[PDB]
Amino acid sequence: AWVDQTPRTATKETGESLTINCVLRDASFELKDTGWYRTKLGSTNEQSISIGGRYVETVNKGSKSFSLRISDLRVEDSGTYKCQAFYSLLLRDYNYSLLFRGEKGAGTALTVKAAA
């Protein structure tokens, strides 16, 4: 499988809004869980985003898609965002399940500037 991430690039003004959509495409298993990662413009270190506050995730498990909406955009939001899919694995008995790290989108290069 692969994860279809849009948009590739975003140039936004401070205060505006951004939605990153991701879709799990040709995937044998279902979307079990999701994660979001970002490399800030300045760093080379991809880091875990903490969902909450202005960062709002919707997950559509039926249609194997998920999205991150960032509102009241700040310059500090600038960077490349990647979403990640996780699949499930049942041990041949149970009742414990086990996550598997799936595919990752190609990213969103977000630039946030103020007016001038």
Binding site: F86, L89, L91
Partner: protein, 335 residues
Amino acid sequence: NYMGNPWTEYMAKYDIEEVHGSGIRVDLGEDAEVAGTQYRLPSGKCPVFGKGIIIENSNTTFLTPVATGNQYLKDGGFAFPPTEPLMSPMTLDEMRHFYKDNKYVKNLDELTLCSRHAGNMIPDNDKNSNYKYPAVYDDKDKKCHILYIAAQENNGPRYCNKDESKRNSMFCFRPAKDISFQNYTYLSKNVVDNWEKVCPRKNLQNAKFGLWVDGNCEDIPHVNEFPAIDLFECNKLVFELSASDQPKQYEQHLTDYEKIKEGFKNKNASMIKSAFLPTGAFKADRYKSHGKGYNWGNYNTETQKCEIFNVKPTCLINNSSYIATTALSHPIEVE
């Protein structure tokens, strides 16, 4: 005046403390956090050719899935239990198919693919944990086996000594280059994708390690000499004396702090979770070799002597009675 060395580039891959950076006999070079608790794990940048784990007093081999009470054995081994769908063990063609939509991953060499594949197993439903499991690849099967147990030795001869001895023991084992592990490679989560160029593999026929001194390759000054009927035995010896990350203060009746110290994560009931943790003047680093040990040997095929040493070599001497070997190297293969 000039103090360079034209051997420098060629010899980088024998600078084991640099390319590898972790233990070799026993690799627990990094610590990762899982669900709040910190565990030790392998972190070697190079593949360890020939290495596996020998389980003492058991029929069961180490690539047999861990004990769950199902398909493979009872008492079991070190490998991930069967799953739906089955991620472990997995063949080369099977991996290349699973990652077929991923251009980088689908073209990786078999060994880096296996480490990467293993890297995808989530520890204890922790989504953002740096903890990744090691793995063993078998060139005969072409099978990547993911390791659920990341510990590499537990055998203090107070409980373990016959091969199990007393009334209520659990798991005695040690790393080895058994003749039956010859096709095996031990792979940490960190095995680099360019290993076949920066890591040792094949032993060097008609070569002896030396030191570059005054524009000249001289013998290694201080070596220890052991009897070795063949190259395999010299390799086993170098591997026995190589960089170790084992808690060299080994315990008796295992406490939970000492369990974690050996690279145990799960007592299988749940997770092993320390309530007091490592505290005081410890650093938390007293058992990180960072690749420091007796990682090299000069095998003399004529005297049957395995000349073993703990300084990195900085050139090669041409000598027909010698094979240059490292603890990472294949036990048998010569070039």
